[PDB]
Design a protein around this nucleic acid. Structure first.
Ligand code: ADP
Ligand code: MG
Lengths: 208, 308, 220, 217, 220
RNA sequence: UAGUCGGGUGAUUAGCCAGACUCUAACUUAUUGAACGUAUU
């Protein structure tokens, strides 16, 4: 459409991708350049033109938190406090959100993880549901990727829905562009206290 | 009584109005409109006969609307909304979730009952007809779920009315602490020159919403945004610049200049030309100074040729 | 098997404890406190007596049931006698001792109890003033709770003749005592452990200077 | 160093740890756990960034709970610097209980719960004090709200009490101050920091009193 | 597997193709398909089913198309629920069927008697000869036992217990309620067995014995 | 420093130039309906 053409020529990644999908060269190259372009700084380190990071997190009636907002740094954020302040809860919330990107990079319409109906809703919340809202950034052509994971308490008649389509839409771009021409892909990883395990050399995985 | 009034306005029989209204909640066409990025919005428009009835109803019955309500108001718009906040340095935006589809017959009648300003009085017999006029039935099999649809001509008026008491209370509260407040449909805007007063507003909103609507209307917490002169400030698509003036924004202005340059060299197609003309009319409304500058930059003759 | 005294030696030197065994044992203790065995014996004695009267009245069909109930009664008496014969702390007292130990040693925990919710026994705790399930505790709180709970269970089982069973003898090894603990807790942990278990020889490893600030150089 | 040996007849990964060649199974738990983290992360980045000259300069988000887990203080002083140098474009989101770790990080990166929160706080904020390059004792007190000395030990209060006694007796070493001084000396020793501080207090108070007498004359 | 799953349970899932082992290694399209067409009389000449799987990271998912199988299996399930009908047998016998026989046969929990135990492990490859032996012994015990004698005995016991409660012994009311429940359960099972229109255990035994002797030449 | 605002230039959604701003802190949105601007009459 003419509207998408204008936005795409203005540098909007989603519009460029939509035009690519409907006409299936120029638009493909736009999408691929958006992902792959970058430069080597004065220190000799490669820097992508379009960075990807979590900007903001909001927790509503999640575990200990009635309503909590966190603004994150693009490079390093350190959370401190006494035991039981919810430091681990915050990382768990983020990891579940990231699972939706990973699922959709692997498989079209893949399903990420969910909030627990048994444990994750705040015990004394009057409304018996919880929300984890995240906003991600991917360069100036995609300044906001909002995701919400939601869950209602066990045995509540009214069920609260998650909103994950933006995650899926971005992950689709990575998956489809990669299929045509190889690109670099984002790494998502969680290392919790479970990383302290006994080592066994002998037990070998036959699942892929 | 509502029937008799409508019949008179529409020059139809009481019987034919009444017969039409029996299945009026199902007389909606549903279609999709593309979003500006990826995806679609779902819209439900009433059938022509129903639209006529809805318009007649709104004509016959004046419902109160607060002055802070900027949307769907005669002689007001996005310019007036943005202008209300242009002099303040700190800005807060809040958004209501599923605003139109959250408004049910129950909410409507509660608001009628509660209303302070002079509400029309309806006979109990008329209540059922009014529900059939104003509310859409999305699910054929579930006769019990009636909701306002954005696409109906009556929905703006009803929604503004339902927010009347809300607007009264919050406006009064904000005025005591020197906060400017306006509402454009589901979009709430707060601005102030005093640091840190805006931080309390979101909590105040949640309490008030619960008080007035229970769990039916809720704040969208992901869409609650603080801003200042340190950052970009916009109100309903209009940029407020650091000189406290309304602006289209630098990027939009640069795009318009691009189009004009293309026109100067006879490169614009008719579709793009028509688009340019429309955008210049809007620009003239929001930022007349921009048009003056374009006239200076591009020759009055060129611009007149374009707009003629 | 969790009620057997020498279950206290089960997997003692395996490195993890058996916190699951604690939970099972603790729920068991609760059920027995709410339902005493002698009333069951008295009730069973009454049922046996009623059934014996029916058999004496000519109803030979209930003789099989009488024999079964007599067996159940004998078993109940034997268990009671074995419990009596083991000279053991009452189940109520055992429960109380362990609860006190946990609440004294674990700073965030003020109370621990068993609820019957729906149709299942659940251990609940008051953690930082809020009632939660064990699964809702932080990893640091749970790990430390697990250590103390397990140790207390074993001490109660192995020291039935002491007024305070936690004043028994033993040798306890703890690797990385500061594991998952905030500095504030590190300042209290050794003091609390030594107060609760005064006659245990503790051999511990640490990387924490805050822990060392609470210990004499002779112990290092 | 890290390498694979096959010559025994089974595939073994070996490492040079502190100058000694050992198997992975011979590593301490602290070393193994940290090795595991870095190895896993590096593997994934290499696999996902085939077009970069340095694949570890790829994009991503990595979450690490309790970064100081099993690390000696010496290692805690290097861990964040090493990670950021090896993975320069990753967003790291970290939790810690370690003042030593915090001494290597700028205050802007730190998000800190209010001490008496109870889960109704709306926004997390940075500490008031700059942590990067600061003394650990200060971080403990100013940022983590933990006293420099353990409050549940009597000896932790002696120097404070000694100072108060000096101030109460117009700066002169009375019978009570002398007893406590001797206790401090006996317990902490002759070249202890505590005793030196006590000595310092005596000297400064004597000099202050001499000034006061000169002023009175 | 998809028919079996849906006969047993509404919305039951059969087995899926593996991404690792089932997809051809040099497949240009990077997906695999197993397409089957079934016939069920002239009214349903074609029941197509497709099992599909795509490789990880492909631009498009390839999903299985199983609705016709589920629809047909739903007919069998729903009609059977209202009025008992005959159901299809599905079985796989691999080379795994050659395996040693454990003599040490398990006690009758009562799962082997349930009609839909016929679908248990039916496509596993080995059969369940152990389940046969248990079921066959069960059939024998029931044949040698009288039918509803337990009910008659239970009826007699409930009548005797009712007389005792009517005679003023209120202590045995709890036992009466338990026995009435047992009686009702026995009658219901009998009625369900009666309602399920199933062959007598004697007849079932005979059929199987004849089958074995007819097919297996060395066994008379 | 960074981000932001945007007067100018620039076959012009880019780039470059000039000036400014900084409550922990914008993420530019939706039609055929409603309102507003323009055109038509
Ligand atoms: N559903 C819940 N409702 C209320 N409080 C909860 C719930 N789940 C966990 N908690 C509380 O939250 C804390 C969990 O801490 P955690 O997230 O592990 O943080 P940290 O790792 O900093 O200790 C505990 O204090 C626990 O009681
Ligand atoms: Mg229009």
């Amino acid at each position: 459409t003419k509207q998408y053409e204008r936005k795409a020529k203005g540098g909007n990644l989603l519009s460029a991708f939509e035009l690519y999908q409907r006409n299936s060269g120029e638009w493909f190259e736009m999408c691929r350049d958006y992902i792959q372009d970058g430069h080597v700084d004065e220190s000799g380190i490669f820097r992508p033109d379009n960075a990807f990071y979590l900007r903001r997190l909001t927790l509503k009636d999640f575990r200990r938190f009635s309503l909590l907002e966190i603004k994150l740094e693009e490079d390093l954020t350190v959370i401190i406090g006494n035991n039981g302040k919810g430091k681990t809860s915050i990382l768990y919330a983020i990891a579940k959100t990231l699972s939706w990107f990973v699922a959709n990079i692997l498989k079209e319409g893949g399903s990420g993880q969910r909030l627990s109906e048994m444990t994750d809703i705040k015990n004394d919340a009057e409304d018996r549901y919880s929300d984890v809202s995240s906003t991600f950034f991917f360069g100036k052509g995609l300044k906001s990727v909002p995701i919400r994971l939601s869950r209602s308490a066990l045995g509540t008649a009214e069920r609260r829905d998650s909103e994950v389509k933006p995650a899926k839409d971005l992950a689709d771009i990575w998956r489809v562009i990669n299929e045509v021409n190889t690109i670099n892909l984002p790494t998502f990883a969680l290392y919790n206290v479970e990383r302290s395990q006994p080592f066994n050399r002998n037990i070998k995985d036959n699942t892929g | 009584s509502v029937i008799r009034g409508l019949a008179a306005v529409l020059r139809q029989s009481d019987s034919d109005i009444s017969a039409f209204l029996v299945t009026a909640p199902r007389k909606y066409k549903v279609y999709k409109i593309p979003k500006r990025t990826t995806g679609f919005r779902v819209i439900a428009q009433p059938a022509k006969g129903l639209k006529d009835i809805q318009r007649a109803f709104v004509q016959l019955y004046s419902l109160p609307v607060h002055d802070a309500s900027m949307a769907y108001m005669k002689g007001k718009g996005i310019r007036d909304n943005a202008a209300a906040h242009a002099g303040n340095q700190y800005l807060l935006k809040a958004d209501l979730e599923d605003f139109f589809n959250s408004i049910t017959p129950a909410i409507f009648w509660r608001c009628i009952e509660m209303s302070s300003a002079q509400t029309p009085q309806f006979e109990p017999q008329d209540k059922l007809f009014i529900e059939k006029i104003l509310f859409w039935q999305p699910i054929k099999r579930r006769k019990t779920k009636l909701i306002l649809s954005v696409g109906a001509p009556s929905s703006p008026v009803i929604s503004n009315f339902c927010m009347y008491e809300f607007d009264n209370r919050i406006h009064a509260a904000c005025k005591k602490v020197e906060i400017t407040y306006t509402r454009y449909a589901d979009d709430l805007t707060f601005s102030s020159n005093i640091p840190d007063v805006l931080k309390a507003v979101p909590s105040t909103l949640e309490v008030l919403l619960k008080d007035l609507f229970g769990s039916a209307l809720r704040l969208n917490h992901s869409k609650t945004v603080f801003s200042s002169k340190a950052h970009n400030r916009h109100v309903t698509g209009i940029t407020i610049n650091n000189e406290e003036t309304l602006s289209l924004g630098r990027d939009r202005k640069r795009f318009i200049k691009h189009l004009i340059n293309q026109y100067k060299y006879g490169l614009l197609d008719n579709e793009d030309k028509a688009y340019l003309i429309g955008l210049l009319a809007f620009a003239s409304h929001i930022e007349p100074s921009f048009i003056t500058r374009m006239n200076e930059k591009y020759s009055l003759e060129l611009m007149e040729r374009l707009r003629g | 098997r969790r009620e057997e005294r020498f279950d206290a030696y089960s997997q003692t030197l395996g490195g993890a404890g058996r916190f699951d065994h604690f939970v099972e044992w603790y729920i068991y203790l609760h059920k027995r406190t709410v339902s005493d065995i002698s009333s069951s014996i008295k009730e069973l004695e009454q049922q046996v007596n009623d059934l014996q009267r029916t058999v004496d009245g000519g109803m030979v069909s209930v003789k099989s049931l009488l024999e079964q109930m007599k067996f159940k009664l004998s078993e109940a008496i034997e268990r009671n006698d074995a419990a009596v014969s083991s000279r053991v702390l009452t189940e109520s007292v055992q429960k109380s001792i362990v609860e006190k130990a946990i609440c004294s040693v674990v700073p965030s925990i003020s109370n621990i109890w068993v609820e019957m919710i729906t149709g299942s026994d659940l251990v609940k705790v008051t953690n930082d003033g809020h009632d939660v399930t064990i699964d809702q505790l932080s990893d640091g709180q749970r790990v430390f709770l697990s250590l103390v709970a397990d140790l207390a269970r074993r001490m109660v089982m192995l020291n039935p003749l002491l007024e305070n069973p936690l004043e028994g003898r033993g040798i306890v090894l703890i690797d990385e005592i500061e594991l998952h603990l905030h500095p504030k807790w590190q300042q209290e942990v050794i003091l609390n452990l030594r107060s609760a278990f005064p006659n245990i020889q503790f051999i511990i490893t640490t990387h924490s200077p805050i822990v060392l600030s609470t210990i004499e150089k002779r112990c290092i | 160093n890290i390498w694979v040996e096959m010559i025994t007849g089974s595939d073994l990964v070996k490492v040079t740890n502190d100058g000694h060649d050992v198997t992975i199974d011979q590593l301490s738990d602290g070393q193994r756990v940290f090795l595991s983290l870095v190895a896993d992360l590096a593997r994934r980045m290499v696999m996902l960034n085939p077009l970069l000259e340095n694949p570890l300069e790829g994009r991503g988000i990595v979450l690490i709970d309790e970064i100081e887990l099993h690390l000696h203080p010496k290692w805690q002083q290097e861990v964040i610097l090493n990670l950021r140098s090896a993975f320069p474009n990753i967003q790291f989101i970290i939790t810690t209980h370690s003042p030593i770790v915090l001494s290597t990080i700028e205050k802007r990166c730190i998000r800190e719960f209010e001490p008496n929160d109870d889960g109704d706080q709306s926004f997390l904020d940075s500490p008031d004090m700059q942590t990067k390059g600061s003394e650990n004792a200060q971080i403990l007190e100013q940022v983590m709200n933990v006293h420099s000395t353990p409050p549940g030990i009597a000896e932790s209060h002696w120097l404070g009490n000694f100072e108060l006694l000096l101030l109460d007796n117009s700066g002169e070493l009375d019978n009570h101050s002398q007893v406590l001084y001797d206790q401090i000396k006996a317990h902490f020793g002759i070249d202890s920091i505590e005793l030196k501080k006590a000595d310092s207090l005596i000297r400064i108070n004597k000099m202050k009193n001499k000034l006061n007498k000169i002023r009175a004359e | 597997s998809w028919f079996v799953a849906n006969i047993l349970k509404e919305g039951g899932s059969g087995q899926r193709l593996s991404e690792m082992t089932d997809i051809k290694n040099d497949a240009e399209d990077r997906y695999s398909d197993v397409s089957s067409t079934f016939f069920f009389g002239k009214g349903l000449k074609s029941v197509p089913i497709r099992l599909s799987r795509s490789a990880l990271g492909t631009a498009e998912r390839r999903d299985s198309e199983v609705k016709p199988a589920k629809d047909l299996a739903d007919i069998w399930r729903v009609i059977n629920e209202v009025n008992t009908i005959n159901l299809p047998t599905f079985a796989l016998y691999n080379v795994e069927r050659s395996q040693p026989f454990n003599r040490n046969i398990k006690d009758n929990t009562g799962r082997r008697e349930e009609r839909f135990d016929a679908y248990s492990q039916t496509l596993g490859g080995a059969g369940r000869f152990d389940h046969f032996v248990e079921w066959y012994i069960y059939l024998h015990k029931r044949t040698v036992s009288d039918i509803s004698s337990s009910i008659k005995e239970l009826e007699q016991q409930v009548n005797d217990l009712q007389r005792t409660v009517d005679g003023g012994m209120v202590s045995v009311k709890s036992l009466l309620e338990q026995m009435k429940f047992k009686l009702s359960e026995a009658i219901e099972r009998n009625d369900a067995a009666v309602s399920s229109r199933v062959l007598t255990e004697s007849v079932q035994k005979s059929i199987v014995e004849k089958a074995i002797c007819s097919v297996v030449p060395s066994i008379s």
